[PDB]
Amino acid sequence: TSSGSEGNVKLCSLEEAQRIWKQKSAEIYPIMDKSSRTRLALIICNEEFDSIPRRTGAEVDITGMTMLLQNLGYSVDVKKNLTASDMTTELEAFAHRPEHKTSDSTFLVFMSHGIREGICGKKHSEQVPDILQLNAIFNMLNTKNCPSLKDKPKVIIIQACRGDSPGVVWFKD
Amino acid sequence: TSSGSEGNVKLCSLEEAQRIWKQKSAEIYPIMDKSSRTRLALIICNEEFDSIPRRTGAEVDITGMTMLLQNLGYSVDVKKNLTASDMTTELEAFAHRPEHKTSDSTFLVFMSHGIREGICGKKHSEQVPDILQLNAIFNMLNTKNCPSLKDKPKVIIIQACRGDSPGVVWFKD
Amino acid sequence: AIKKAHIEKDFIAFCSSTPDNVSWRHPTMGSVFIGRLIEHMQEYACSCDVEEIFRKVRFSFEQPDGRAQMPTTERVTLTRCFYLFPGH
Amino acid sequence: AIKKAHIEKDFIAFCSSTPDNVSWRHPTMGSVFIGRLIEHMQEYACSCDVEEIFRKVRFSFEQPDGRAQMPTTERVTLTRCFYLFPGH
Ligand SMILES: *CC(=O)[C@H](CC(=O)O)NC(=O)CS
Ligand SMILES: *CC(=O)[C@H](CC(=O)O)NC(=O)CS
């Protein structure tokens, strides 16, 4: 049933969970007790921009991801329409969250316009760039700047253009 | 025995090869007939530089990789002490090699000094940079510039510093 | 006492396209990469680790149409398999 | 007739360290990442695809010493598992 907390996410059975833990050795990330763990996730989605076109359909993405990450057991923070500076501030705040200490992993989701150099903030234009670099996301969440997530999976997902090219070439058959 | 063509590389048995092809679906890269295939590999190793320190022990790396890639069935091109321009030229020549058409995959190995921006050429100094960008390696070997390796695994291996940092942080236990 | 730890470890990034290239979004259906990821997470989180799931997503994009993209896994320092164990 | 193909696909890069960080080399023993890769290729090419092998290499570096590094997989567009099938 999809009426449960995991919604449409197919469940791993105990026999399945024991088999994964058996077949492969001690090279799986440990999972914390469901009862006590405090899993956290952050979605930053820029939909309305100052200069660049409106990201129509962003609502479907936010809804889908939010529900999915909740289904997987994460408490989801959703922040919308931020400058690169605001995103950095929000990321710094996320890294300082006490729940990470009693969490086993995290998800970070960025959804916005993007260029080759990185993700576009709300105030972005070609004349006055407003860009968050992927490099900065890793730095803010690494062991130095986020000690609480040491040894824990940090999954970053980015929906954005990485340039202007269609990404295709022709060949004959 | 290590006296065979695969040397110290542990062999996949026919029962093992049939099991891998059975357990997982049609999501494995196809392997070409051993009799007719012409697998190619390129090692670029910079050991002696104009300005920066000598990469003592590079010989062990060249030997090890060369033998390994030969063991895996690749004919190995080894090019030493090249500028970023020469490396580009060599890469372009490798992409044009007819053997790729009757190959199922390739390996590219780069071994040199490196900075955050990329791999150091033989003539590199801080005053006059001589850098091959990782970006350029992908571009020269992609579908547009190397159509022969379309749909085929291209494995790039890089031994190089990516900056000056030790890559460590302290924590108390 | 103090101990050394890697500054950067246990990361995986998943981008919607390859460098230099566009990622597509439908006005009512949403972003294709996001929808495809949800679908694959929902189906495969029970049996596959995230690296495996991400590969399957890439595979689903294999046949290009008028709006083509190839999602890309980046800067991977996962030292173990990450299973979500949904339901647990 | 002509058909569309992804400009960039079926790549995997494996770097010796994480961005900003050094990679170590011994004057007589060679580069640690290279030696470790050969060892792991030799042992695991028979049973594991390259993505799996590369993860194991990362795992082998997990405990840092005075000369520490964390090898990093980059720009991955493999859509299938790449098995070397050594002996075949
Ligand atoms: C190029 C872009 O940044 C966006 C990505 C997005 O998901 O909004 N793509 C487009 O605007 C083309 S639909
Ligand atoms: C920083 C570097 O480029 C080199 C990498 C190499 O394999 O030569 N590392 C060192 O010089 C430190 S041993």
DSSP string, C6-64: ESS-SEEEEESS-TTB---EETTTEEHHHHHHHHHHHHHTTTS-HHHHHHHHHHHT-S-
Task: Compare all CA atoms of chain C with the CA of D53 and give the residue at the minimum distance.
Answer: C79
Give CA–CA dist A20/A29, Å, rounded. 12
Question: Distances in Å between the alpha carbon of B130 and those of A103, B52, B107?
Answer: 45, 11, 24
Give CA–CA dist C5/B171, Å, rounded. 7
Give CA–CA dist B46/B61, Å, rounded. 11
Mark yes or no for CB contact B171/A147 under 8 Å. Answer: yes
Straight-line distance from the first to the last Cα atom of chain B, in angstroms, rounded to the nearest whole number: 46
Q: Does A144 touch chain D (CB under 8 A)?
A: no
The 8 Å CB, 24+ separation contacts for D53-61 are D54/D12, D54/D14, D55/A27, D55/C51, D55/C78, D55/C79, D55/C80, D55/C81, D56/A27, D57/D14, D57/D33, D58/C77, D58/C78, D58/C79, D59/A27, D59/C79, D59/C80, D60/D36, D61/C6, D61/C79, D61/D36
How many CB atoms are located within 10 Å of the residue C57 CB?
A: 21
Give CA–CA dist C18/C15, Å, rounded. 7
Beta carbons within 8 Å of B102's beta carbon, 6+ residues apart: B32, B36, B37, B38
The letter for the amino acid at B35 is S
Give CA–CA dist C37/C15, Å, rounded. 11
CATH number of B1-173: 3.40.50.1460
Give CA–CA dist A101/A80, Å, rounded. 26
Give CA–CA dist A150/D70, Å, rounded. 14
Confirm if C68 and C13 have CB atoms less than 8 A apart: no
Q: Which amino acid residue places its CA nearest to atom 10 of ligand 2? A: D24
Give CA–CA dist D50/D33, Å, rounded. 15
* Residue C74: domain span: 1-88
Beta carbons within 8 Å of B107's beta carbon, 6+ residues apart: B41, B42, B69, B72, B74, B155, B156, B157
Between CA B24 and CA B31, with CA B26 as vertex, the angle to 5 degrees is: 100
Confirm if A72 and C45 have CB atoms less than 8 A apart: yes
Collapsed DSSP state (helix, strand, coil) of residue B23? helix
Pocket test for ligand 2, best of D16, D20, D23 (most atoms within 8 A of CB): D23
Q: Does C78 touch chain D (CB under 8 A)?
A: yes
- Count of domains observed in chain C: 1
A38 burial type by CB count under 10 A (0-12 exposed, 13-18 middle, 19+ buried): middle
Q: Which residues of chain D come before a gap where C and the next N are over 2.5 Å apart?
A: none
Report the DSSP beta bridge partners of residue B77.
Answer: B42
Confirm if C69 and A167 have CB atoms less than 8 A apart: yes
Collapsed DSSP state (helix, strand, coil) of residue A104? coil
The letter for the amino acid at D14 is F
DSSP annotation string for A123-156: T--SSS--EE-HHHHHHHHSTTT-GGGTTS-EEE
What CATH number is given to the structural domain containing D50? 3.30.70.1470
Give CA–CA dist A117/C48, Å, rounded. 32
Pocket of ligand 2 contains residue D17 by CB under 6 Å: no
Give CA–CA dist D78/D12, Å, rounded. 7
Confirm if C40 and C57 have CB atoms less than 8 A apart: yes
Pocket of ligand 2 contains residue B97 by CB under 6 Å: no
Report the DSSP beta bridge partners of residue A111.
Answer: A45, A159
Mark yes or no for CB contact A167/D59 under 8 Å. Answer: no
DSSP annotation string for B74-95: -EEEEEES--HHHHHHHHHHHH
Confirm if B138 and D8 have CB atoms less than 8 A apart: yes
Give CA–CA dist A134/A162, Å, rounded. 11
Find tokens 């580009």 and name the residue: B88
Give CA–CA dist D70/D54, Å, rounded. 11
Give CA–CA dist D47/D53, Å, rounded. 9
Mark yes or no for CB contact C7/A134 under 8 Å. Answer: no
Task: Compare all CA atoms of chain B with the CA of D18 and give the residue at the minimum distance.
Answer: B162
CA-wise closest residue to A31 among C80, C7, B162: C80
Phi, psi of B38 (to 5 degrees): -125, 75
